[PDB]
């Protein structure tokens, strides 16, 4: 439905939707922009990610509420409604994965863009894994493979303080702890990421230092919760 709107207008409307907290509209505008077929800039990649993170985040929060109610009850209404929300969540994840596969990842040559999209791929397979059962194994391996490829590129091409590299390592650690039942892998990754970033902070400007230390704080918070 966005095929008749100019790319630049879709991006401008995504920025307005963000200010208006209209995240479903924001995601639709950014999907339209991606479907124009041009690569996305750093700012545009962040708009895409913010839009879908907010949409799927609301769905995940709703699914967790309904799943909790359903687990305590063990009529069909709670199960039926949890299934409805689950199907909608899976549809949003499939949409994002489809944009990544057709054709954002294959056209991303720079490390910053390729790592960003591969991290997103890991994240949306992770959200699928949160609701999957038994099928679950295959989704988990898809998330792991995307995160691992992103990690390999990021370690070769980015400094340890780069915010994309840090956010990737953070989310992969969450994958290990919450999805893959590998809490020791999660703790090891978070600790090594934190320590390597700490030792690189001296190279950063005041602004970059703030960016990197904010994400490092999340690594430390998880380590506190996990140990």
């Amino acid at each position: 439905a966005m095929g008749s709107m100019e790319r630049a207008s879709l991006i401008q409307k995504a920025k307005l939707a963000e200010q208006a907290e209209r995240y479903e509209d924001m995601a639709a505008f950014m999907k339209g922009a991606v479907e124009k077929g041009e690569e996305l800039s750093c700012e545009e990649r962040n708009l895409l990610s913010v839009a879908y993170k907010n949409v799927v985040g609301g769905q995940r929060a709703a699914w967790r509420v309904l799943s909790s109610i359903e687990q305590k009850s063990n009529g069909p209404e709670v199960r039926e409604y949890r299934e409805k929300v689950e199907t909608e969540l899976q549809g949003v994840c499939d949409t994002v994965l489809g944009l990544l596969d057709s054709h954002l990842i294959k056209e991303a040559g720079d490390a910053e863009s390729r790592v960003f999209y591969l991290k997103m791929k890991g994240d949306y397979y992770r959200y699928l894994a949160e609701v999957a059962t038994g099928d679950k194994k295959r989704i988990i391996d898809s998330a792991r493979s995307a995160y691992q490829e992103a990690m390999d590129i990021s370690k070769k091409e980015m400094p340890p303080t780069n915010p994309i590299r840090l956010g990737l390592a953070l989310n992969f650690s969450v994958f290990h702890y919450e999805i893959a039942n590998s809490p020791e892998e999660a703790i090891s990754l978070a600790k090594t990421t934190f320590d390597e970033a700490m030792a690189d902070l001296h190279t950063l400007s005041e602004d970059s230092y703030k960016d990197s230390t904010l994400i490092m704080q999340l690594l430390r918070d998880n380590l506190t919760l996990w140990t």
Binding site: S49, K53, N54, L170, Y177, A186, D221, N222, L225
Partner: peptide, 8 residues
């Protein structure tokens, strides 16, 4: 409590 993932 659940683990914290990357924030916007």
């Amino acid at each position: 409590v659940r683990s914290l993932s990357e924030r916007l």
